[PDB]
């Protein structure tokens, strides 16, 4: 078994990264003027965990870990090739250069989910 | 995206002091591996050896198995993906047949298949093994 640690695949190669995604998603939730403190931090980590779950929920996926969609790669999304990305580069460089163009691919992968479920249903 | 630096050579004789050095700009200098390749006029294009920044594995031809000698040097950083490193090469038991341009070039990605088939390549530096 290959355990690295949390985050210690955010140098690696971003193939090499997907092996070590059980690890970061464990911890990300690990579940008086200290109090105060201690406290307001509690909440956001849910909040922020919450988000991201909301997300992970609405397009569909909701399934933890890689999640495919029928989103076609507008190339201009930084046009590299597969052995271009998954051979060299890393998830901290990926997510810079695709950050400009993230949230667009967001709200895409919001609508198309909907009309699935309606008309898959019926 | 960036170049790499090749160092230029003296004219050397059978017998004299030999090392090329190669400094690099613009990419992160522990992924990419490193190619060492000389063009004489007489065997064509021929691949000495390759060497990784992070590991340190050579693999040599056997033509070079027991008189090149390769180094490479630490990392300098700049920002948090690109670096400033450099790399030696000293080819001993100078025969004529050495004469001639040689070169630097790294590798092309990080894994795979392919990891170091040489993408990025350098300026060139000259010899001439003469008396």
């Known amino acids: 078994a290959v355990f690295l640690g949390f985050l210690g695949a955010a140098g690696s190669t971003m193939g090499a990264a997907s092996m070590t995604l059980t690890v970061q998603a464990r911890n990300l939730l690990s579940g008086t003027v200290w109090g105060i403190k201690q406290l307001q931090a509690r909440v956001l980590a849910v909040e922020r965990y919450l988000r991201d779950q909301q997300l992970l929920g609405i397009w569909g996926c909701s399934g933890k870990l890689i999640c495919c969609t029928n989103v076609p790669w507008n190339s201009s999304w930084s046009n590299r090739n597969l052995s271009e990305i998954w051979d060299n580069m890393t998830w901290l460089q990926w997510d810079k250069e695709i950050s400009n163009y993230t949230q667009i691919i967001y709200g895409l992968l919001e609508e198309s989910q909907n009309q699935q479920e309606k008309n898959e249903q019926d | 995206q960036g170049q790499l630096v090749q160092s230029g050579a003296e004219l050397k004789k059978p017998g004299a002091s030999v090392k090329i050095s190669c400094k690099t700009s613009?990419?992160?200098?522990?992924?990419?591996?490193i190619n060492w390749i000389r063009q004489t006029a007489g065997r064509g294009p021929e691949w000495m050896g390759w060497?990784?920044?992070?590991?340190?594995?050579?693999?040599?031809?056997?033509?070079?198995?027991?008189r090149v000698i390769m180094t490479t040097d630490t990392e300098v950083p700049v920002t948090s993906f690109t670096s400033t490193g450099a790399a030696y090469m000293e080819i001993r038991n100078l025969k004529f047949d050495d004469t001639g341009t040689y070169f630097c070039?790294?590798?092309?990605?990080?894994?795979?298949?392919?990891?170091?088939?040489?993408?990025?390549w350098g300026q060139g530096t000259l010899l001439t093994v003469s008396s």
């Open positions: 070039a790294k590798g092309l990605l990080r894994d795979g298949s392919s990891t170091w088939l040489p993408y990025l």
């Open positions: 613009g990419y992160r200098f522990n992924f990419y591996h």
């Open positions: 060497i990784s920044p992070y590991s340190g594995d050579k693999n040599l031809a056997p033509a070079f198995q027991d």
